[PDB]
Design a protein around this ligand. Sequence first.
Ligand code: CUZ
Ligand code: CUA
Ligand code: CUA
Ligand SMILES: [Ca+2]
Ligand SMILES: [Ca+2]
Ligand SMILES: [Cl-]
Ligand SMILES: [Cl-]
Ligand SMILES: [Cl-]
Ligand SMILES: [K+]
Ligand code: NA
Ligand code: NA
Ligand SMILES: [Zn+2]
Ligand SMILES: [Zn+2]
Lengths: 586, 573
Amino acid sequence: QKIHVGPGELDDYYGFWSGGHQGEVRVLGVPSMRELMRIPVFNVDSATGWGLTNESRHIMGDSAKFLNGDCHHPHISMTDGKYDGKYLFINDKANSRVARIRLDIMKCDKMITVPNVQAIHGLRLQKVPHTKYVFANAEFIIPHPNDGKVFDLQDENSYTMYNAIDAETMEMAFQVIVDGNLDNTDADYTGRFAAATCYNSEKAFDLGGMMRNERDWVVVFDIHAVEAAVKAGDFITLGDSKTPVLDGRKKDGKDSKFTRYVPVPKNPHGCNTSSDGKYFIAAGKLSPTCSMIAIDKLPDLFAGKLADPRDVIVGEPELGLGPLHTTFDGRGNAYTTLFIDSQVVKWNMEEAVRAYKGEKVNYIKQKLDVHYQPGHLHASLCETNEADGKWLVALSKFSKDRFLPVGPLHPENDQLIDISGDEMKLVHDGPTFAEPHDCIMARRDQIKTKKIWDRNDPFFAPTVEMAKKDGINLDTDNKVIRDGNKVRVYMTSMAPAFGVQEFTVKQGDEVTVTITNIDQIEDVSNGFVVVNHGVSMEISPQQTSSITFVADKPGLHWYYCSWFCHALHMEMVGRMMVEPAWSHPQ
Amino acid sequence: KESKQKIHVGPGELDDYYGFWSGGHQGEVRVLGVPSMRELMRIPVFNVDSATGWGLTNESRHIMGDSAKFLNGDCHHPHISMTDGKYDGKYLFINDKANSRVARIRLDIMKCDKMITVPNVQAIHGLRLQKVPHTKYVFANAEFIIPHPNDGKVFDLQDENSYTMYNAIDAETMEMAFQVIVDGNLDNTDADYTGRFAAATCYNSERDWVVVFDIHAVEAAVKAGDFITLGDSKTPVLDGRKKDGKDSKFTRYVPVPKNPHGCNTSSDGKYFIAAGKLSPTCSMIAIDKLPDLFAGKLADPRDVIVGEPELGLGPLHTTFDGRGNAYTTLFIDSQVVKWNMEEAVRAYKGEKVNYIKQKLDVHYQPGHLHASLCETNEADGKWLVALSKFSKDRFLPVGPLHPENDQLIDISGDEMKLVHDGPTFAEPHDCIMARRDQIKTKKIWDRNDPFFAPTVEMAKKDGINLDTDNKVIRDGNKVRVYMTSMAPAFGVQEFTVKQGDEVTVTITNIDQIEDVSNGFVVVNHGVSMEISPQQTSSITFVADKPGLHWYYCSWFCHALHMEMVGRMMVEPA
Ligand code: CUZ
Ligand code: CUA
Ligand code: CUA
Ligand SMILES: [Ca+2]
Ligand SMILES: [Ca+2]
Ligand SMILES: [Cl-]
Ligand SMILES: [Cl-]
Ligand SMILES: [Cl-]
Ligand SMILES: [K+]
Ligand code: NA
Ligand code: NA
Ligand SMILES: [Zn+2]
Ligand SMILES: [Zn+2]
């Protein structure tokens, strides 16, 4: 299996890395592991203007006031258990958001702040019949309402919730109150069941408390029952949110219609569906095991045909110290990160299941040393029924001496491992910034991108509507619209010239500049920077982009095209002239 | 001799050079390993960095000063400080064209530690360092002509008080040293190997020129008090314009075709080489003739030109292997051309000599290029990076935006060989390499480090010993939390405030194990920062929402990382 991609060759896979607490999504080529693109999501990007432009701030809504994010879990939309390459979704733990990225333009196109929760951590997508719902965990228990009268986590109204977002509209679909808390989550291959690990069944706030219980659990959700309850109008609502809220807590030992709690040790972390649809696999973390939940047994569990929730567990292989996450090669083998032992352990799920029945057999096939302290791992197409068993990436949190010293802050080490054969082979050390937690790979032919924008694209449709109110045709017009103390400049751009090369405003005017790049050649991006005003944005071919700033400085102020576009790039400039306040009224 | 160097750095092996890439329009600096071309670290400078809190923390906003209000930057030209014409590994400097700044990075901690807004100019673009006897001055070009004063009374760019200026910053204090008014507009700049001379291309005389500065004469004028000041800046300003055809004393204007661009000093110190851009040539200025030029011993400013090789369409920039060759990017022809400087000089006198050695195709439209140690008299002729603006089909498609293609070229032998295509984001533009042994970094912070000294001072006023204390100080509607942190526990795990209070959280990571970084995020408050071992970091926000609000450690630091959390309780008003 070729490891190196030479000049003029292309990678075989796309890789979508989370940006960690840096807040972006990174697009890598695999197996070269080179970064092809950064997709700003929760960060402010000086280069494209994301978080400065009117289009981006409209997508972010009120959360445009935050300059930070913390993302962990990127996932690609599916149809019938296979990637369809339309959307990628990712969480924000820092400000409790979920974002959707459109894979054809590789931009964030929708974002939602999840109501009545703190900290979106785990996220995964419905697999079958297609990604109708995005499932997201809120990690921290809070009071409801959270108005500062009650702070106690033990109050009957202190809880966290499992969240379902409608993937196509990016509005809330429902929320399910749970006992304990939520960590990671996955979904079955039927659409009926989802599952999440919980580490704080104690509802404590201190370290000792959260480790008190021998087992926490994985909570299993019957989504068909939740939908049935929503259609029956049997739910409540919290605060000013109209999201249906259903109660999945145990009420004095009686289970909810919506949930069942399977005891699992101990502060379990990863929650992964095997690619054959047979198991939810929960990594035991503080327990040196994984727990294997038989998805075929869940209907019987929800029908009261099982005496004990543990009856749905059909294996608990002892793997090593600090199991965190599991992935699958599609040949019947599972691969699990051991954080403390600092290894990846390859094991055979069916032999694990036989050993739980007492049939002594060695289900452990190989342990590979990794460098050092691995968190997530991901095998190519592992989240689909097309898991192809070629590449594995283990994302390690301490790189120590694996790279040149760069000061007190070290890179993460994302290691590429060949699993096409019976023996795992470590082939590449990839340093990365800001702690990617997880990543997802797709075949080159599962992703189709646009090279030029459509003029009706929803990304800037609000800007086109604003232009219409001004009677502007964005494809041709170079006009300055004046409206009181507001000024709206509309121009075309066509390397190496701005369509409006000079305009005059009053000191204090609120200036919006809207640029439509009317080039036809792919790859001729234009930029727009206003010197010393904190204004920067990119405009690609056939895109309309706009940005608003206050002209608070009298005098002459240059603007220039930031993106190299032509041999005469450094001459694509213009002048804003600001008449002083003392020459105008007030 | 062949070009054979190994290009692959396998698991467990280390790169041989550091690469310092400009972050382009994204505004950071990037640290790469060469020859792997992998990104080891991101250093935030003009961008806001959610991961480390740069632009959010009190320490970073203090360094940024008033310019902390800007969320953007546009950088191009990174350069490492020198002693005796060799890298000394102390500082990296870089420009901000978007908001007219120069920043200094300390290479021992890989953080930006000083920043200056250059007064009375618009857009810092070209930038280079004094080489000899060391980097006393940072030289920076302001690109755009503006009125003086720029108060809205005059907009005419041909008014007698409309001009731009060459800028000298004191490298060690990061205060302005002096500015020199010039004719025309400035593009790129370089310095000689003595400290007396510097030079800059000008593209908008409206043949343009390379303006040469006699820095000794400028310094003499400043020491004698013969200068003016502009506006509310105390920076000495000297007039380097031609007045009625009379030369300044501080400057000479050397005619050079055409809209010249790059301005590069050869590593043997002999030449300033200006790339022709619209002219298919480079022009070679003999630095050893400059004293005679400023002494009025030469008939014509063209007499310092000793070579004008014809290279190809669209020469932009030049670098050096230290063996006597120059390497120039041809933007139009989309090539790197290798040529021999001494043979070009002899051709200029009329000898039939072929100075061109090889043309290598690159992909596509190269701008800057950089050979290893080329800015020093130690130029080693091993590696060459050409930074190409249009990558086209060289990488997988990723939508309407495309990556720059930074291509690594083996120049160790007699033939250039292309060995790697490196995609990069937001047009890094230029880069600089240093030997592994030229860079020495700290493993853990020193407690006396200037980076957070202002925070140690605040703590002093509160009577706080940052190394041990876990305390909440109340002062009106201000709340100052001080805590130590030690994975996996925050030293203060809960505190209570009033809605509306202005909260400052100061965290001191007292771990002594390298690489055990901590983070601090306050949920739904837009607060995020990093605290590495022995660092103190601080951040201020207002508690504007009543109720219970969790905070957590963002940096995976421990098996119990998920459980390293705290509670802020906000009492309603
Ligand atoms: Cu957020 S957790 Cu194991 Cu996913 Cu990294
Ligand atoms: Cu438009 Cu460069
Ligand atoms: Cu402290 Cu993770
Ligand atoms: Ca527990
Ligand atoms: Ca000109
Ligand atoms: Cl998981
Ligand atoms: Cl240059
Ligand atoms: Cl040679
Ligand atoms: K790390
Ligand atoms: Na939204
Ligand atoms: Na400063
Ligand atoms: Zn440049
Ligand atoms: Zn250039």
